Amino acid sequence: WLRDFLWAQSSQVIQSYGSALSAYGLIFLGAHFVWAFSLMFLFSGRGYWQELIESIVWAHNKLKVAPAIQPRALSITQGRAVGVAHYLLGGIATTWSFFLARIISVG
Amino acid sequence: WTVPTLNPDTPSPIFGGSTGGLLRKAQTEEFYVITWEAKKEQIFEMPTGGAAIMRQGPNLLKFGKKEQCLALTTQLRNKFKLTPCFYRVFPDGKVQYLHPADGVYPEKVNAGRVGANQNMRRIGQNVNPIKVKFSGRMMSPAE
Amino acid sequence: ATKLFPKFSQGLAQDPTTRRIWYGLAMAHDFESHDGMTEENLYQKIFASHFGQLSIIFLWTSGNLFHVAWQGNFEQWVTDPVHIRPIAHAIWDPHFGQPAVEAFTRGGASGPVNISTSGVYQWWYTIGMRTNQDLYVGSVFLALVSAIFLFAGWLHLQPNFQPSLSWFKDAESRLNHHLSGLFGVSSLAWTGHLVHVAIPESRGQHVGWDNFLSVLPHPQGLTPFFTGNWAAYAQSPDTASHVFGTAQGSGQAILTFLGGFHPQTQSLWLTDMAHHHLAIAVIFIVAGHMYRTNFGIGHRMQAILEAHTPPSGSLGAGHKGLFDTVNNSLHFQLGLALASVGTITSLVAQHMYSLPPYAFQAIDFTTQAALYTHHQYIAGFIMCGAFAHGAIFFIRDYDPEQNKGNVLARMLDHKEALISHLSWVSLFLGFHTLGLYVHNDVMQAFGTPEKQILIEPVFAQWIQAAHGKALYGFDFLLSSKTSAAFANGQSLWLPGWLDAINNNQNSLFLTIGPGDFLVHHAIALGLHTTTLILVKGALDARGSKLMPDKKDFGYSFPCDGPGRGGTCDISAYDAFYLAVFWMLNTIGWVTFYWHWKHLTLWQGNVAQFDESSTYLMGWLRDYLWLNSSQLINGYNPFGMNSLSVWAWTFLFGHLIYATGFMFLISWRGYWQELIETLVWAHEKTPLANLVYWKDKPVALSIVQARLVGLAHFSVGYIFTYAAFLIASTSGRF
Amino acid sequence: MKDFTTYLSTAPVIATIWFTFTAGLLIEINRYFPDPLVFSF
Amino acid sequence: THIKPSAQVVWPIVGQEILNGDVGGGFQGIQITSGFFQLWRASGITSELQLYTTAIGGLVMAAAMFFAGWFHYHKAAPKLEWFQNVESMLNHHLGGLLGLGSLAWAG
Amino acid sequence: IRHRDAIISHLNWVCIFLGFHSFGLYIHNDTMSALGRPQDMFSDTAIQLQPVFAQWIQNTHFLAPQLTAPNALAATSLTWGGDLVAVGGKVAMMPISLGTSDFMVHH
Amino acid sequence: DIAGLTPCSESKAYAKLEKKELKTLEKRLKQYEADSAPAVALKATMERTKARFANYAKAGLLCGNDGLPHLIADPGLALKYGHAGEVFIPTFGFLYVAGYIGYVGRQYLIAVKGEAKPTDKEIIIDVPLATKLAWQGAGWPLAAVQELQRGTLLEKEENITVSPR
Ligand code: CLA
Ligand code: CLA
Ligand code: CLA
Ligand code: CLA
Ligand code: CLA
Ligand code: CLA
Ligand SMILES: CC1=C(/C=C/C(C)=C/C=C/C(C)=C/C=C/C=C(C)/C=C/C=C(C)/C=C/C2=C(C)CCCC2(C)C)C(C)(C)CCC1
Ligand SMILES: CC1=C(/C=C/C(C)=C/C=C/C(C)=C/C=C/C=C(C)/C=C/C=C(C)/C=C/C2=C(C)CCCC2(C)C)C(C)(C)CCC1
Ligand SMILES: CC1=C(C/C=C(\C)CCC[C@H](C)CCC[C@H](C)CCCC(C)C)C(=O)c2ccccc2C1=O
């Protein structure tokens, strides 16, 4: 499945640059981006980002640009939801780009 | 008030059987028994799973974990307004009373229960972990 | 009841669950969290553990030597070292098929063997070894050395030899000795070896134990040394017609200053290596006579630190109180050591490829790739551990009252500025590097490669031209023929240095373009973000606004509950944890850049990198997709070849990485209820409830499964890239 | 329609309007000045 | 059998006119994969005007649905005992929705 | 809810059983073909796991118009078997064979 | 000839790339009619390509061995050899706008701090105030340096820090 499906049938999506299907290659790469971006939310936890955020809020307070709506890290449930959303979006869109770029050319 | 002795003659609610009941922990280490006197027959919710019918009068119920007994305790206290009291039973027959350990429920004062594990300082007045280093076991500065 | 395995922790030995086993496997070397541990006993157990690590290292080198001597072809490799492959060891796999035995029979062997990519062949050939007997003897000697170190570790655990605590806290004599003897006399003896053995063996003359008291390293022995006529030792260097290992164009000098590369090995001369280690030896021996010992002269480091307080207290109390801070803290010294070791491991990597020391290296491409990727990933892990132990210092060893006003407290006083500025740098670099890469991607997609943001790295090119690379025409310092830096070193290193740096066939100061610009800025992104995470964890190790009592919970604790909005991955341990991902990504970018630049150099196709590396579909297609062609065809339904092991390993790492995803995304509480169901199933299944556990099945804890997912992740990352590297480089070359 | 104009003053509607305006401005700039790689004019 | 189904034209703004591929029929656009052309041929459309009026009918029906939501919330909203007539809802969704709908589509 | 433990325990066991006997087959083939033992793989050639039930159903629906659906002129799909329909040179639909690979992927 | 780069006006790979792209577009063009929408579109794209290449070659860009224009980020090398409008001038062209955005945001925040419910003027934008500040913030460098010189740009250490500062 690596060789003869995911590597062989990927020749149409990664060489689509400069052609009509180039947007498919773009959404290939961007979907690979979003999928991996999801891993920032799935592998991590809120308590790190709250402390990073408050060290940033210190810099905003120092320059008198701290917002009235207090910046919080996303909920735990929200972190998992964002992560699964970006994961599904990126993976499904990677598959979408790969499928369509392959099959519009060879089919 | 005095510590009540567990009555084994107390009947149990009408339950049709589950799979969330007792395990080998009951036979080996410990299990728990919760009792309460009901005014009517009410279908309550078992913490193990499924619904059982409590009996009019006293009831008794076995559980493998104290959290189960206190879950049912808050359910019977909040939804049915009862006053249950549970124990800890050991397989050798030793019974240990647990929840209203003074007679009244722990959120209410009793005028004579002793304060334990109370640090009389502020949480920021705790020492640094360098001062409690090499105290034998790994020890928190709260001690 | 109470168990026996965690002898070092009685709280774990009373655990009725499977958590005892894991946490005892993972608290074994945290000696300061042991039961009944004192500081002196801590230092002593660490002394013995260092002895054990030394013994293990030396046994490891002995095993490499032994297997190269036994199952390798070293006597054959020294004959034709540009066309014979290095054999690591032989394979006895009863699972092999006949095609696999037919396929792993490489390098002139009589059976299946593994092609060495560790470079030990080139190293051992450079330092004077030409025989399998030499490596056999070296293996025996290093195993005896390992035995000696093991016996010493047992010995210095004995009552009359158990060192005192102050002996460990004695830093001035340890530093003096580890600078003079361990560093400079070791370099002196290595220069003695080079001069006596390695250089004459490179000049064809065999010099072994049996004749090194009977032959001379120089035709005028030691007369030039004791009469100050030291240039006589740079008399007749090796010519450019020299061939390594024989006496064709040999030369008689032993301490030259030629610079550059040997023309036949494309590696450094052994003669300026000897002069190098000689100068290093003298400098380290003079440096080792600095600190105060039992002889009345020297420095006391506490005095240097306490005297180094600037006026205006721009540093606060200066370094007052830092001597007792570093001396009484093992995590501080460990973090400094890991910082320095990782930085010099990065130096080893960045220099061993451009200035390749070992003969017939730079022509073994897979060896170069493996060595660089290896030492870079080692450096990344070591540098992450540095900050991790800095955090553990802040928690376990830091005293705010003994560091009252010094630089180390001044860090914690302005920690928010450090974290926020590191965050700004990371944010800017990521925004802009990704933006430029996506822009070039879109321009390639829209058929217009001429609209890319191709920024010429003129700063690094200016540096290279200052080093004498005339490709860019800055004509600045060493490329300027009419300069002072050029005219002064012309009787010295310069001729070879410029012949080696203006040659575009070696890795010495490769020419760079906008792809190099973009990927160096990606490297900056990774470094700054990794150190952001790590520095943040170290500084907020003691407290945050979400948790100001974090020091009271230790280094690695799971969380502070769902309260106060949520406190998941709030420890410093989890900051290190999240930084390991960004480190693996940083080093992956680094090694991708290295491997592709060198795959295009070795194939003569640097134009492919100069064109495709400016956009990320170039990196995907022309690097990852293109160079995977032989790897994944290592085995097909038609058959297999020697790359099948690397294909299987590739898929192996792809499995392990993804398996770490399981411990990384799914968290404990789904699995604990699953295991509750399985406990019911086992207790109620007939003929199987007869068999019962002694340790209660529980799910992996939070911190534990974090570590486990990180380990599966790192192992899969590393194995996948190692397989890809070795297979895409060994498949071509 | 004080409440309706308050609604249009909300964060997402104002962001939609402002980014629609910004994107349209950049788009019309890139139409009337195609392929602006450098500042030559 | 020769012309690629396309129904999305891209504006020529920043170079994305390369996405207007040579699909066929003297056309330049994005080759759609939703299968609307086959569905329309199977419906017997054979004219772009019928698609135009179907679009206008769809917009009319959309406005009708939104008017219906506003009505059945703000003007005349049903009681709980109306929703709870699942017997009627099933009888109707089976006779008229899926029965009469299939009958009309058969017609 | 009273016997959810039995439910989930048997479901867990079947998930483990299927994971092993469906993916470890792929791992076994990877290990065999990597070791150079293609006669030890799970293939249509070495160790056949033929999907005989689905093959029988294919043949039962291919022969359906002859016996069990006499008023049908042909089968519902050409995927059961028989002749292919090719339109415009391209294959519209043709019989689909199932072998060991299909067994493994279905599992 | 800064870093060995050839100017794009005399670069050969640059011209080869122009010819390649135009050859691709005319290859697409030959399958269409004289005056059709695809033909006019491809002709317009060819003209845009020709104008783009001409304008990049006119602007004095430096091209590499690949024929692609390479930008010069160094001021001093850009100001000397006439490449300031590549990275250097657009640098300040960006920074004006970016500090303008940031200063308008800062001014809006400081403005809504004083109100009764300051958080509701952040989910619901006070568009009058926002537009007034967005118009009067065009002098953000002068006002920013004047707020900096008075000491009223930076908050004192009333900032919320942590237990170990
Ligand atoms: C972050 C990195 C980055 C950078 C530096 C650039 C830079 C650029 N891109 Mg790339 N791009 C990026 C990321 C990036 N992009 C990403 C991530 C994508 C994928 C979405 C793209 C996709 C992309 C495409 C598809 C195209 C570009 C284009 C461009 C160019 C645009 C020039 C322009 O619009 O002139 C604008 C010039 C100005 C002077 C406007 C400045 C802003 C204001 C208006 C100035 C103020 C004046 C005045 C006071 C305003 C009046 C006030 C008003 C309220 C009335 C420039 C080279 C175009 C191009 O040709 O590139 C060569 C192009 O076609 N980019
Ligand atoms: C001359 C006397 C002397 C010597 C030789 C040593 C030597 C050593 N001591 Mg000892 N020590 C001494 C005096 C001395 N010490 C004194 C006086 C004290 C008390 C005051 C101590 C107290 C002490 C403690 C408490 C410990 C040691 C330890 C060690 C070991 C350091 C670990 C190691 O192997 O890294 C040596 C590594 C290097 C030399 C490499 C660095 C050199 C350069 C910079 C690296 C780059 C080039 C590289 C070498 C190239 C490699 C190429 C190729 C070969 C691969 C080493 C064996 C530690 C140990 O291992 O315990 C057993 C330890 O825990 N020492
Ligand atoms: C000279 C180097 C050095 C030294 C002496 C120490 C020493 C110590 N470290 Mg530090 N550390 C180091 C390097 C070092 N570390 C590096 C390089 C890193 C970054 C990777 C860290 C990161 C780190 C953290 C984050 C923590 C420590 C901790 C500790 C302490 C206990 C270690 C422990 O739990 O043992 C037991 C450790 C293990 C059993 C390791 C788990 C297994 C590893 C991941 C290997 C798995 C690989 C796998 C088997 C490969 C299979 C391959 C196969 C599939 C083919 C101890 C003081 C801990 C501590 O002090 O607690 C407060 C702690 O929390 N260290
Ligand atoms: C592809 C995956 C990926 C990406 C993009 C990032 C990105 C980032 N991480 Mg990392 N991270 C990842 C995986 C990833 N991470 C993983 C797997 C882990 C392990 C859990 C971590 C752990 C980690 C830690 C521990 C930290 C970070 C930090 C950061 C930030 C670094 C600053 C930076 O470069 O800003 C540049 C930002 C980007 C490149 C991403 C934004 C993308 C574009 C530019 C935004 C706009 C797109 C578009 C217009 C919007 C469309 C949305 C909508 C309209 C549809 C940045 C957001 C650090 C941080 O927060 O410091 C600031 C930090 O402390 N991350
Ligand atoms: C313009 C006419 C109008 C007006 C003034 C109101 C006014 C009101 N409605 Mg009514 N309503 C209307 C039309 C109207 N409705 C219609 C047409 C429907 C049918 C859908 C409803 C259905 C309805 C329900 C079911 C409810 C209300 C409620 C309300 C109250 C507050 C609603 C609110 O917060 O709106 C602000 C909300 C919006 C602007 C959301 C609009 C969502 C639209 C319909 C869909 C857009 C989706 C979009 C395509 C997604 C794009 C994705 C993006 C990322 C690109 C208020 C009394 C609520 C109420 O009484 O609670 C007390 C309530 O529960 N309304
Ligand atoms: C490649 C990644 C990977 C792998 C191998 C697994 C594996 C598994 N998951 Mg996990 N999971 C993953 C990613 C992965 N998951 C991710 C990314 C998520 C998203 C969060 C999840 C979420 C998740 C949930 C939510 C659940 C699982 C479950 C399962 C199990 C079901 C299959 C099974 O038991 O078959 C048997 C095992 C395998 C197929 C694994 C491969 C082993 C092969 C066959 C070789 C065996 C080696 C053999 C013993 C030789 C040993 C050698 C010796 C030297 C040690 C299994 C342990 C389920 C579970 O535990 O309940 C059943 C479950 O409920 N997983
Ligand atoms: C957390 C912490 C820690 C850790 C930390 C770390 C880890 C750090 C690192 C750091 C690092 C890692 C650093 C690095 C640095 C570097 C440097 C500083 C460099 C320098 C350089 C130079 C100076 C150069 C010079 C020169 C040149 C330029 C070239 C040529 C030659 C010469 C020499 C001239 C500890 C434990 C301590 C504790 C506390 C806190
Ligand atoms: C799935 C889906 C879809 C589609 C769907 C469809 C297309 C459906 C259809 C449906 C239908 C198509 C329906 C129909 C219906 C109809 C009706 C409902 C009618 C009625 C009528 C009536 C009611 C009448 C009556 C009468 C008359 C008038 C005659 C005489 C008698 C009587 C009275 C009876 C889509 C993809 C888009 C999206 C997703 C989902
Ligand atoms: C990155 C990350 C964060 C930090 C993400 C931050 C808090 C929010 C991300 C961006 C927000 C949405 C700001 C974007 C801008 C605002 C919408 C306001 C608009 C202002 C202008 C840009 C228009 C978490 O809080 C988290 C929590 C639990 C598990 C994983 C994670 C996690 O991975």
Tab-separated table of C-alpha atoms in Angstrom, chain A residues 35-77:
chain	number	residue	atom	x	y	z
A	35	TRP	CA	-3.316	17.398	10.078
A	36	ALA	CA	0.035	17.851	11.802
A	37	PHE	CA	-1.141	21.128	13.309
A	38	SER	CA	-3.849	19.103	15.029
A	39	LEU	CA	-1.044	17.330	16.864
A	40	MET	CA	-0.243	20.569	18.683
A	41	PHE	CA	-3.647	20.282	20.321
A	42	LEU	CA	-3.816	16.519	20.756
A	43	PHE	CA	-0.350	15.852	22.135
A	44	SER	CA	-0.358	18.866	24.438
A	45	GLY	CA	-2.375	20.139	27.350
A	46	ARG	CA	-4.004	23.344	28.441
A	47	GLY	CA	-1.850	24.053	31.463
A	48	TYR	CA	1.240	24.715	29.381
A	49	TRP	CA	-0.525	27.167	27.116
A	50	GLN	CA	-2.106	29.015	30.011
A	51	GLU	CA	1.320	29.783	31.440
A	52	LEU	CA	2.715	30.688	28.041
A	53	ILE	CA	-0.325	32.899	27.537
A	54	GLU	CA	0.168	34.617	30.863
A	55	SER	CA	3.834	35.243	30.122
A	56	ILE	CA	2.587	36.833	26.894
A	57	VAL	CA	-0.071	38.763	28.793
A	58	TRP	CA	2.776	40.123	30.864
A	59	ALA	CA	4.257	41.634	27.715
A	60	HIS	CA	0.841	42.975	26.779
A	61	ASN	CA	0.384	44.515	30.230
A	62	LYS	CA	3.840	46.054	30.039
A	63	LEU	CA	2.836	47.812	26.824
A	64	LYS	CA	-0.659	48.564	28.141
A	65	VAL	CA	-2.295	46.387	25.480
A	66	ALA	CA	-3.727	43.679	27.672
A	67	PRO	CA	-7.339	43.044	26.649
A	68	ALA	CA	-10.270	43.359	28.985
A	69	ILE	CA	-11.496	39.935	27.891
A	70	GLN	CA	-8.877	37.915	29.682
A	71	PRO	CA	-6.909	35.611	27.389
A	72	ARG	CA	-7.351	32.008	28.435
A	73	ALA	CA	-6.058	28.842	26.917
A	74	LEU	CA	-8.715	26.761	25.264
A	75	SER	CA	-10.657	24.357	27.399
A	76	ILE	CA	-9.386	20.810	27.661
A	77	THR	CA	-12.456	19.553	25.854
